[PDB]
């Protein structure tokens, strides 16, 4: 089904990211942990999407832009330094 496929795609990417961390940190993740992180990530997209949409509407836009995403990424000041430094290089095209 539609959402099963999306979750599988997430789970694959999460597995790959966790593998990279595991390889780097020399610490294994259980299969259950990887699945939980995939599920967490799928659910977190629900919150990101609603917030983004509200931030856009807040500025009277129906199309979500980079300012909406940077507002989203405000949470941590270290999260903020990344989003502002990663909006420039993509915007180097």
């Amino acid at each position: 089904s539609y959402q099963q496929r999306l979750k599988a795609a997430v789970h694959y990417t999460v597995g790959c990211l966790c593998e990279e961390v595991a390889l780097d940190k020399a610490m294994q993740f259980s299969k259950q942990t990887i699945a939980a992180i995939s599920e967490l990530t799928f659910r977190q997209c629900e919150n990101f999407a609603k917030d983004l949409e509200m931030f856009a509407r807040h500025a009277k836009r129906t199309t979500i832009n980079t300012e909406d995403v940077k507002l989203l990424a405000r949470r941590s000041n270290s999260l903020l330094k990344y989003i502002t430094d990663k909006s420039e290089e993509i915007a180097q095209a």
Binding site: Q3, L6, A9, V10, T13, V14, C16, L17, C18, E20, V21, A22, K25, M27, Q28, F29, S30, Q32, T33, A36, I37, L40, T41, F42, Q44, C45, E46, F48, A49, K50, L52, E53, A56, T62, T63, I64, N65, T66, D68, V69, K70, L72, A73, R75, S76, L79, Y82, I83, K86, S87, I90, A91
Partner: protein, 74 residues
């Protein structure tokens, strides 16, 4: 390594309240990067917790302890 733009687009569109809502290409790229950060932070924090309790691997018990603060940070 990371998320494909098309995947992230579909995940977000699953949840928009209005069918009129769209996402810019540049915003989509920033979201791809932000989801990567989220997942890597979950993993790395889990590893830190496991290290701290001298566990053999990151299992769900370890992950659960780091989740509340992770979510606060995102």
């Amino acid at each position: 390594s990371g998320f494909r733009k098309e995947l992230v687009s579909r995940l977000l569109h699953l949840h928009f309240k209005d069918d009129k809502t769209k996402v810019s290409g540049d915003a989509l790229q920033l979201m791809v990067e932000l989801l990567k950060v989220f997942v890597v932070e979950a993993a790395v924090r889990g590893v830190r917790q496991a290290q701290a309790e001298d566990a053999l691997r990151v299992d769900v018990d370890q992950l659960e302890k780091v989740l509340p603060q992770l979510l606060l940070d995102f």
